[PDB]
Design a protein around this ligand. Structure first.
Ligand SMILES: CCCCCCCCCCCCCCCC(=O)O
Length: 283
């Protein structure tokens, strides 16, 4: 038994962790109105995508990884001697990436595929990858890892804000809150993005983000917080630094940024604050 752990590009893991653990990536892509296609990777500068998304009369379109791209990654890992693959996926409620990975796992032969619906995105989805890799080192077997991630999913969530709900409404990735389409505060619930609160100012939106998450994680034996920043770099840093001061060092407070696919649906000002009821190994 040789267990591998892979994921899609929306987990937004750093290249250090991808190089160190040899994490294979089934990438997602973005397509602009001028015909330019771009698959997600750590090579493209994220601020270059934000400049292009701002310089586009049409909101760009994203695409999940094709089922043939999961199969190619499955066959490559199988041909390297791997017998079991743990696949961490973008939330099935916002993308068909998980179902594509799930169906590809049924089609590829000679290897066992264990697809997991993380029900979230960004580095919060990547924390499942890091938890799975940690358990593989510990000698666990795929079903034990899947059961551990399922329990981890019950104490994992995210709140987020956006400048305008036009990017999410165009993509249909926002459920409800049609009267809102002030600053909205959204949240992930069962893998979907739903409204949570409508606040008066962007400043009180970020304050609301911290209050909602801090009120939840105080009942957790372990806490890993993740600031997922957008194009406004000062928003994520101010929240990240304020969390470092307001939270005890027993809390693991980390920082990360969105990629092109997530930014295409959030639009400008896409700031998020995620949490996991575990102490994830980030090294
Ligand atoms: C704090 C962490 C939460 C951050 C939330 C980021 C995800 C919001 C928008 C997701 C929609 C993009 C998925 C579409 C992919 C596809 O085209 O299949």
């Amino acid at each position: 038994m040789k267990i591998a752990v892979m994921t899609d590009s929306t987990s937004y893991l750093s290249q250090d962790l991808i190089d160190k653990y040899n994490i294979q990536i089934a990438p997602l892509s973005v397509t602009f109105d001028d015909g330019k296609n771009f698959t997600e990777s750590n090579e493209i500068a994220i601020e270059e995508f934000y400049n292009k998304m701002a310089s586009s009369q049409t909101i760009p379109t994203t695409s999940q990884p094709a089922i043939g791209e999961w199969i190619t990654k499955y066959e490559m890992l199988r041909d390297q001697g791997y017998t079991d693959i743990i696949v961490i996926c973008l939330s099935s409620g916002i993308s068909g990436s998980y179902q594509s990975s799930y169906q590809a796992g049924e089609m590829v032969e000679g290897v066992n595929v264990h697809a997991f619906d993380s029900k979230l995105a960004a580095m919060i989805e990547g924390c499942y990858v890091l938890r799975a890799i940690e358990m593989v080192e510990e000698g666990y077997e795929p079903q034990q890892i899947i059961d551990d991630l399922t329990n981890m999913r019950e104490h994992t969530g995210a709140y987020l804000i956006v400048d305008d709900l036009k990017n999410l409404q165009k993509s249909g990735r926002i459920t409800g809150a049609q009267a809102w389409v002030m600053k909205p505060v959204l949240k992930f619930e069962d893998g979907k993005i739903i409204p949570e609160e409508k606040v008066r100012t962007k400043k009180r939106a970020i304050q609301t983000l911290e209050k909602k998450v801090l009120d939840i994680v105080k009942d957790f034996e372990e806490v890993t917080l993740f600031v997922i920043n957008g194009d406004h770099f000062e928003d994520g840093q101010a929240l990240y630094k304020k969390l470092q001061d307001d939270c005890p060092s027993a809390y693991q407070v980390a920082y990360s940024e969105t990629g092109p696919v997530v930014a295409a649906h959030l639009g400008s000002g896409g700031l998020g604050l995620g949490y996991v009821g575990r102490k994830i190994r980030l090294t």
